[PDB]
Amino acid sequence: VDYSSEVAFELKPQAGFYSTADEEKTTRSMQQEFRPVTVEELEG
Amino acid sequence: DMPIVCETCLGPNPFVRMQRIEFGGTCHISGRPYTVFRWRPGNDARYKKTVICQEVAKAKNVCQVCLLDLEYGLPVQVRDAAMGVKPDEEPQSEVGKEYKLQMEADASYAAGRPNEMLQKLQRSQPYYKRNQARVCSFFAKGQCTRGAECPYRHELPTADPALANQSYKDRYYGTNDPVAAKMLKRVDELNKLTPPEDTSITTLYVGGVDASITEDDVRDAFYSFGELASVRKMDVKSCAFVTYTTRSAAEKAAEELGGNPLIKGARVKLMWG
Amino acid sequence: NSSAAVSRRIASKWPRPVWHAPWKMYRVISGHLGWVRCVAVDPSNEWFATGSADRTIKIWDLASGQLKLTLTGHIEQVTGLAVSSRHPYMFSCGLDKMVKCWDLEQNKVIRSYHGHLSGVYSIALHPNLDVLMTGGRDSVVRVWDMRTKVQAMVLSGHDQTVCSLLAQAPDPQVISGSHDSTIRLWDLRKGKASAVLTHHKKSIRALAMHPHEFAFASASAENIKKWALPDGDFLHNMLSQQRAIINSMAINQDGVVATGGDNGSLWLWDWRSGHCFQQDETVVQPGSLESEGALYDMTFDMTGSRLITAEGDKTVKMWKEVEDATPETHPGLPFRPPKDIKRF
Amino acid sequence: WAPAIGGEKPSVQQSAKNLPGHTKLKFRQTGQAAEEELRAKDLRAELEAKERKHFGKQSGTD
Amino acid sequence: PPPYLRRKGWVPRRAEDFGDGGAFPEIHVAQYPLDMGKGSTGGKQQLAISVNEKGEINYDAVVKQGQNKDRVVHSDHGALVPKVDRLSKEALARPDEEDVEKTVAETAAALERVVQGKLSSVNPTKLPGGPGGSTLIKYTPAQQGAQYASGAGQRIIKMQDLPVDPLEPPKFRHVKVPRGPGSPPVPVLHSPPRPLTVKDQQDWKIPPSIS
Amino acid sequence: PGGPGIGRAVGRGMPA
Amino acid sequence: KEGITRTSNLSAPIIQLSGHAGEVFSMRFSPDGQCIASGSFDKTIFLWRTYDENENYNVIAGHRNAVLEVHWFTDGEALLSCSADKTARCWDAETGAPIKKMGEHTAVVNSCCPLRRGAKVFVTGADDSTVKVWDMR
Amino acid sequence: ARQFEGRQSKGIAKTVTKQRIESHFDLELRAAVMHDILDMMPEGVKQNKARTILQHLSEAWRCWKANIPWKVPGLPAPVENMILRYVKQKADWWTNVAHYNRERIRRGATVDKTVCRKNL
Amino acid sequence: APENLYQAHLKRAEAGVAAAYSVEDYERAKAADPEFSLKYGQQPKLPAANVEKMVAELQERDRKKNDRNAHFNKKIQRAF
Amino acid sequence: DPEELAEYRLSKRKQFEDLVRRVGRFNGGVWVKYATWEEQQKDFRRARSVWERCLAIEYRNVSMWLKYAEMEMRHRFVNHARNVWDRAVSLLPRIDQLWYKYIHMEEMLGNVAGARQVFERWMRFEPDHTGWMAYIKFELRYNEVDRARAIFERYIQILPTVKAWVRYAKFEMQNGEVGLARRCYERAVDELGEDAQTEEFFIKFAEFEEKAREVERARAIYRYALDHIPKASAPSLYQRFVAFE
Amino acid sequence: APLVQIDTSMGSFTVELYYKHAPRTCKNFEELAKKGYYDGTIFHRIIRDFMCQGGDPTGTGRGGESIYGGKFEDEITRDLKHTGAGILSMANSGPNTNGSQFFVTLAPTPWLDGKHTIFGRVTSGMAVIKRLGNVQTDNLDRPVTEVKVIRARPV
Amino acid sequence: LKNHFVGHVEDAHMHPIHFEQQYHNFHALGFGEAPSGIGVVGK
RNA sequence: GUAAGAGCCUAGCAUUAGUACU
Ligand SMILES: [Zn+2]
Ligand SMILES: [Zn+2]
């Protein structure tokens, strides 16, 4: 599979009482960021 | 029980004989065995068959045959662009795609205002010429013996050579679909009214205006995109002068109103005055 | 309402226990060579079958306790037994993943129901359709056509071993209890749970229907609950805790609920009030461990006057009512209504 | 540690054990404990009769 | 904001211009209270609250979704509560033998549907044959214009099943997927946790096994 | 001489 | 539930009669209102009860083409069937036998009507542009 | 069909045949002990010591076979009694299989080549 | 212990209300908002700082905080 | 960072998917690593799907609901966190800690109306004394003593106990009301009625009327106690009465 | 005439009733609120970006009675134009066929100007309407969680 | 509220002459009867 | 010495849809 084109077997969070449009936008912005990270920092 | 089909891909006949081949094929997207339907749209037609699952069809509101959208008949790109919606999240993999399907089994396209963009960029009458025999591959190579009898078009292929390699999955999803690419570059040029080398020409010419449109009516048209310096009628030409005070406002007025807007019904053209 | 409000209602209106004569154990039958694991009474009430860890099914005379016949066909323990009321058929399941239809006119296995991926733990015959239901360690109730041996249905959703099973003619036609601590009430037409009951904290190893009322009892290591049907409305807990894993539960027509513990306890409760009028411990037959003392199955005979228990000391034990008892000579354990104010 | 869970065109592979057999069910007739025949009797009479017979005619004494 | 028939010439521009929202039909510019009506409305509509006559909110919609929409889901505390109303022999009364007979018949019918599907569909010696006859259908499109079907409204479709070759081997290979998530979870309607002593923490300390 | 007829209760379907 | 004023004795207020294998071209209620004569394109006449089962208790055959029109005779025991096979036929209803088959028309016998007061006489008009009157005996 | 549909190698049930008889026993045996373990633990006890209880059951079986009396000093008596009852279940099974295979070996009935060694 | 970490959860509760919010903060947020019901689901009007407060608060918590055979015995001398 | 990153991410995601199809269902631990890694990559669509696949395996694990909602909280996804809390608290309404952390998240955002609505849902599931006490302390924290008083009314009704009543009365004697603390002891003996006969109830009555300097009231209390209390229970009460004298 | 009140299971919001541009419709809504008619009365049709229909007591959506005994006529103007959210208009099945059913608009719906008689706008509780448009609905635009109008009355 | 997905699919029953006759009045000739009963179609 | 696999180059199975201009 390509596990960066697609989300593997994606289970989207189920809708609740609160509107999560803004949260989804922020997640995309975070994904867009590309700060330098070493392998140790990314694996912890 | 019935294909989900573009009503162009049913041809002029109000009566349709269609063959129903249950388990007749694999969906060209979900790779799933499904019920195929085959038919001849009209007398000048060939026999077209459905290309995708019924579900995979009604997900993206596309025809089972042409894979074009159902409301406007433009590829899934051009509609997704005007819909402004995210890239396809749907998994390209088939383990992924079938997992998504078996999920959605066990538990956005109908509620949009008609987009003027798509409406502007669509065909008025049906492309029945899409329901017609392929081109005779033996006529191309000059070796066709079948004469005029050939059920295949006795013409040569006149096609973009980057085109004629289109992918099902890409015309259904919307990624590098060369036809909608051509179409969006067309609208890119038509949305590209040349802002001339003269920077200070702050006037836009409004031509083809039918007489029942008055000068304050075109003022009601153009006031939104910036301050007007002066609007000038001349019905002899059925045309108008409109000068603004800032260039960028006339740029706005060209960019929004270059792709032939209609003020109160009149098909009117814009030019840099 | 509340727990306080309802507790006061309960102190006022709890159904009082109906007097039930005590039961005494009058017969041990030795002869199985492994834990007796299942019992089943024949609808004529003249023999019972017991399946064992020694892999056999023994047919016993219900009045003499005499070994009529031994049937060997399972490779592993016999875990469930069901004698058909409408067919001359016995059904067995086993840890060998196999379900068998025994022709009782041949004394032979004539059909096999193939498809459990692990050991089978529970069996139930639909009382009106020619359908059987088995549950096992694959967390699934497999619904079989009795005739064609076909797996008509899989009831999916449990997460651990389906340990108990009920079948009735009204909806829910299958009730299962699992090691995942839930009870599913199933819609047999749709193949879907019509209810999931999550009130138990331990695994539901025993289910029992009331012979006449639209209600079932479920039993855990922690509580015996009583549930109204169709929808599985929690009625109540038994007013005491057998502090045991309950392997087996049988309900009588008098409303004697017998529950049998993994420690060999046998408590007799009043259905309808929830009150235990008797508490017994097993005696294990000579040689046994006292660790090897569980009570794996119990059934009442068809009259309700005998209780046959299948035990881990490899005995069948038989209990009869001391019915020459009267509410004065033999009241048993006496009742105090649930007077407490508690949290539910 | 964890068993396989067993959830449920059709495949055309036909097993030998899945060929037709025992294609009709036996039902309990009159005389084999059929349900309508068994409402008619008192099973407690027959049980206490058989138990008394066994329990006396194993004791060997009147 | 100016009251009814007091708004001539007074136009709103911002959210704060509406008071607590609403828009003005007297005005003839598009208003956007609370920024409602800005392009598309977002994604994935939210669950709704249900409030009583008295004002007791219901949050069940969290738990009553998907396949849980259909079934009995115990969500609250009163499902945990002993029901004295209901313990009488008359309260726990089986359905009418007539309704039970209808259920037995419907279930037999559905189960024989499934069993005969499993027998026939999966049996391959069933000799394949002729063409599944034409069925007419009347199909009325979404989009009917005087250009579609040449100015006709509806379509009659002759649906002709094409016969399959009896010698046609199995056409599609079978695909493997992991099983999906399942039906949605159900509230765990437990009694209060019973406190583990530290004693009963120690009498379940299991020494390590030294082989 | 009962023939190959049945009568069953069914609602009348509606197009909308 | 919904309790809307049951008019008839029928089990339900809408009953579909199935069992035919062709178009149903004409139907008729018994004069005493407890029979159905249904004539199909399948050249066959179903006899249904109007109450308590809606049982098609008889299928009368004997026309070689679509039975286009059916009436009952004034007493309800004799039936007049008219067809496309150029043949009008008098049948006995209770019995399942045909009484008198007259085929004088040259083309499809479209229409017929039996007289309701007087003798056993029925008109039949067919494709030959001729309307013919037919006395029973 | 195997050529054109592919092998249906997926969750179809394997019979318990003579070669799987002893390994399936232990599957089922351990699953049974695991049932009991999860039901025996009190409500807030970390339910992960079951693996060490299963190791104690393996040990107690080897100790039975070798005729070694065992006494784990800190084993809860419930856990120990569960182990003893299931080691006795295996001991009954194994001894009965030994009785059975001895009668077949004595008769001359067909036994595997390893059944002779296992029975000795 | 749930009582130990419960008084530590109340440690955190009263500490964070003493650390991130004030009485006029609270009461003027209310003075803007009459509904303190039936409004469930709709996010409430509160300063955008509040969010990072929570985050920073919990992140605060964060900065407070052979081979395999050695561990085994180290459990036993621990116990034995 | 570019397209060398992306393929290291492909490699580690294929590693995670392999480990998860192997070990994922039968032994926990793994989805937490997978989801914390996807959180390190700042990919929250992917990490939310990993947490949802954990909870699709086993939703009854409080640890997983906590780690999920905390991932969501610590990245300021606060409506997402609320939704996780709503589900965790709907599905496991008997884990007090879920309710605590939902309430805490709401008051850390200065959302005390939302925190209070979570407290109302929790009180509907009838928590222990500690749940009602936390609710009361919540309403005190925002100096809402009318609200805390209404919670005490509900508290002493729901759990009718001496602990409920003596805590109510301690609240009142802290609160500024001493005729109300007397009122609450009096009301405890009438409402509680029976089973208000006990040691610590009378010990608390004595100490209250003592720090009210009504020592004749307190003597009546001590006697009426020794009268009503079973003198088996008398040693502590009587030594404390000696301590009064 | 001013300030009728709807309080629903999702919340409470209040609409003014326009006196001059549409007297018949406004009097209808006034009086029907007064008589206890819009009680229960679930919002049956909710379409995002479009409208929140309500007013049919039967829950079908097919007909809601009036004070005049049946239908009545529109009051379309070149003044009253559906311009934004919160506009309260009547639901008709064509020209001059209003009943009781109304809809609050959630968006600018030009394509209804000339067909649906406006009579007001939501003065207070636009938050409730925003939350109410985004509620979960089925394939018929019917809220999957019933949105009752627990009480409607003038103020 | 519609039946199929992109419109309403409804069962029909005619006699077989009629499908074929209309299908070939339009099919071959270009102009035929509308199946809705509303006039004729095409040129 | 098994014999497993990864890859490289070259490496003959399935498909019938899609190609516009005021
Ligand atoms: Zn098409
Ligand atoms: Zn050619």
Author numbering:
A (entry chain L): 207 to 250
B (entry chain O): 18 to 124, 138 to 303
C (entry chain T): 175 to 518
D (entry chain P): 9 to 16, 25 to 78
E (entry chain R): 35 to 245
F (entry chain b): 100 to 115
G (entry chain E): 45 to 181
H (entry chain A): 721 to 840
Please give me the paper's original passages concerning this structure.
The C complex is remodeled into the step II catalytically activated spliceosome (C* complex), representing a functional state poised and awaiting the exon ligation reaction. In the C* complex, the 3′-end of 5′-exon attacks the 5′-end of 3′-exon, generating a ligated exon and an intron lariat. Here, we present a cryo-EM structure of a step II catalytically activated spliceosome (C* complex) derived from the unicellular green alga Chlamydomonas reinhardtii at 2.6 Å resolution.
The U6/5′SS duplex extends to 16 nucleotides in Chlamydomonas C* compared to the eight nucleotides in S. cerevisiae. Notably, a γ-monomethyl phosphate cap is structurally ascertained at the 5′-end of the U6 snRNA. The key nucleotide U67, of the U6 snRNA, is base-paired with the nucleotide G20 of the U2 snRNA, and two catalytic metal ions are coordinated by the phosphate group of U67, with M1 sharing a distance of 3.2 Å to the 3′-OH of the last nucleotide G-1 of the 5′-exon. The splicing factor Prp17 comprises four fragments (fragments I–IV) and a WD40 domain. Notably, the residue Pro89 is inserted into the catalytic pocket of PPIL1, which probably represents the potential target of the peptidyl-proline isomerase activity of PPIL1. Fragment III (residues: 165–203) of Prp17 contacts the 5′-SL of the U6 snRNA and stabilizes its conformation. Fragment IV (residues: 211–230) represents an α-helix and covers the U6/5′SS duplex, which is likely to assist in stabilizing the extended duplex.
